[model samples]
Target chain A: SSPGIWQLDCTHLEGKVILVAVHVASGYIEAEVIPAETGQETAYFLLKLAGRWPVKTVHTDNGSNFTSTTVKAACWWAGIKQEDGIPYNPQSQGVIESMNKELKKIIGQVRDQAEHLKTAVQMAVFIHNHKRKGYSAGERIVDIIATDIQ
Target chain B: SSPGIWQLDCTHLEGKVILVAVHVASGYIEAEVIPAETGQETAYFLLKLAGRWPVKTVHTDNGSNFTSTTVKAACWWAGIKQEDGIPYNPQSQGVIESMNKELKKIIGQVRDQAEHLKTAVQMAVFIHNHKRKGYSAGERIVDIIATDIQ
Candidate 1:
């Protein structure tokens, strides 16, 4: 299993869906831009990511995309426990929630006002993950997990 | 201060913006069908809702409508702390994220596959909330909050 519980979530930006998974204990983050937020896509992507490293658990809200049988079964098969936030208490899953805000904020500030949101968000995530200021969030992930930067 | 954290999220269904704020602790939910998802509309609606009850914190994903200075300032002045989900993680703000999906799903499933999305979502939220199977999520909220359903 992965060393820590991985917080998972997705957001819509620039008319596209962006997925994010973070290892809360180590502050390691993984992000990607996707075309839509459907169960099939979510299941496929999540299952693929599981192969790259250990992911003991995936805690998410109750979107069908993540809670649907397809995604749940995939995680079960992959040996990744799937958990959901309490009925209405999202703060229980707070770490990745902050990342959503920062991700969009960076895209808005760094990209041109009229630029595509996907472009800005993708670039921002890449840069933010690689940032080395006093041990960046991405750097922390790198220290523990072996994965590509992009 | 409100009893627990609140989760907020909005989605465009039937070409209209549907905003939902769910009290994390009791499963009470507030939903509205708005004209648009712009900061102005968000600020206006959120503030209007705040007058009805105590809302300690609002957790949202990285939608500019929620992150804009207008909304931020409005929440600040309203005495409601604004918390955001991770950079691209909508799942962290899972309570409302699930609401977003369920709102749209109900509309799509109940409407004449050809009816307007707004009408369907508005109806769905009401019906879904009133359901009292083994204790409804709405009933929990009604006990704590006194607000208009419209």
Candidate 2:
């Protein structure tokens, strides 16, 4: 009756379906995918992709399918707020897992030209989500309007 | 009848100022002026070209023309003590205002331009207001201010 994504090894054979995107406000983690390893059926495909948008928080890493209970009841019916990265040590999901090792080193630098490395990873995530992340000349772009990530 | 000062945001100048020469006992600042930006009568004409200096402590920012009343009667006949910048949060005014962005990037990397960026910002503001502030990174917490961040 329930399988909202939960799998020890979230399949990387690449059928493309794995999900993890956590940080909406600092439960942090912002991204992760491995497809085909979907447990709790990838927590109901991230609760139908968190019902098409809006996800305020959902930390993880102390696995067992992200501390399952049918993925914390589909992150409490999609308002998502699961968090939990310490006990038994899960490297506190370091900043979306260090942007998943910088997106697997830019997908292993074009996994050897995997078809124009998909236009060099959609132009490195559109130039890292639209440029400018390091200004430092007494950097104070309005004191880096941060709620957390610096 | 104040003296001089005017160092502030200058990009073709509009009104950026910060000019100090204050001392009035141990609390030093000695000299400063990075002009161009105008108004407030060009900060009383750069504190009258900073002559015969020494002006207690007149920190500012609640900008009603430097808390008007003729800048509080010229800081009540030079006893000065305006200290503001904390009603809308300008970092409770501290950390020597990062020596105004480290003397504006050491006067924009002075390699002889603008006269070695004005003698490398007066030898880096007299070696950071007299021999680089302080140095001690071993043991200090006011001897443990009872820590707790977990």
Candidate 3:
């Protein structure tokens, strides 16, 4: 868990699994390219990224990748509780669901252009976090962390 | 201090920082996108990915990003050590230095093409890892991890 891996959604493309975390309010994101969507990666998420946020709980689908002992135990250790979204209802967690759609478009465009996935993702994150119009997600979070310091 | 953040050259494009872990003997790669070339993101890399593989030492140039309490503490927890490369010696780690060029080219093409970086990277990794009568970073890693099954 790299302090950027938890409270997230995991997706795939051509068997490559990508685990992504988004701050629902700020729209800030953190992601990784992992070998699997197993509890092992999920445990890494909870242990690493979850610690940085003021996260009290997580809501996920009832999938083996997230519900297994390794993941649950990691959550226990992180002191964050976990809950399951309503079965078969994507709308139950509309925020991440929408983010998935947006990311897929970016992923598809990148695939179409034959680019490097990891590097392109960093660029995408940069744009997503950029404070172009009003304050952006990255800017907001920076303020969030900075205020904590003050 | 985590093993995953070391043993590779961390590079950048625009403002995006790329932390890559390469297995020199086999040409395998595991990477992440971070906010900056700072100890904070570097520390995350060590704690998150290093535990999954057998990593002992890392060699990098004299950069503040790779040096600091946060990065040192993370590496210490992962039971790995760090070393500095020869001053102004690009050829010391010729493999990844070349890889950085290849990656940047791909990234530049992606940026110019208006594509996402992650999918482009996956394609690049796929080709780089292609094992059919050729060499790829991805291919070697698959074979490396797959050998455990045998």
Number of the top candidate by DockQ? 3
Model 1 per-residue lDDT tens digits across residues B1-150:
345467776777657778777676666555667787777566654553453335567776456855699778658645678877453554455655666777677777767722455445544655565556575654455434322211
lDDT of 1 at A10: 81
TM-score of chain B of each: 0.74, 0.26, 0.69
Tell me how far the alpha carbon of residue B129 in candidate 1 is from the true structure, in angstroms, after superposition: 46
Q: How far is candidate 1 from the true structure (C-alpha RMSD, Å)?
A: 20.5
DockQ for model 3 equals 0.03
Error of 1 at A11 (Å): 1.5
Per-residue lDDT of model 1, residues A1-150, tens digit only: 345467677887767888777666566555656798776556655554453335678876456755588778657655678877443545545655677888788777867731455445544655465455676654454334332211
Candidate topping lDDT:
1
For model 3, the stretches where C-alpha displacement exceeds 4 angstroms are: A1-6, A87-92, A108-115, A131-133, A144-150, B1-150
lDDT of each: 0.60, 0.37, 0.55
**Error at B74, model 2, angstroms:** 62
Query: For model 3, how does the per-residue alpha-carbon lDDT over A41-125 read when each residue is reduced to its tens digit?
Result: 6766654444334445665534674568877875665566666644354553676677767777666654543235653444344
Model 3: lDDT to the true structure: 0.55
Give the runs in model 1 whose Cα sits over 4 Å from its true position.
Answer: A87-94, A113-117, A144-150, B1-150
Q: After superposition, how far is residue A131 of candidate 3 from its true place, in Å?
A: 5.7
Query: What would the per-residue lDDT of candidate 3 be over residues B1-150, giving only the tens digit for each residue?
Result: 222223656777666777776665566555656666677666656544443344566654346745677677656655567666453545546766788887777656545432445434433443343324464443344344334222
Classified by CAPRI criteria, candidate 3 counts as incorrect
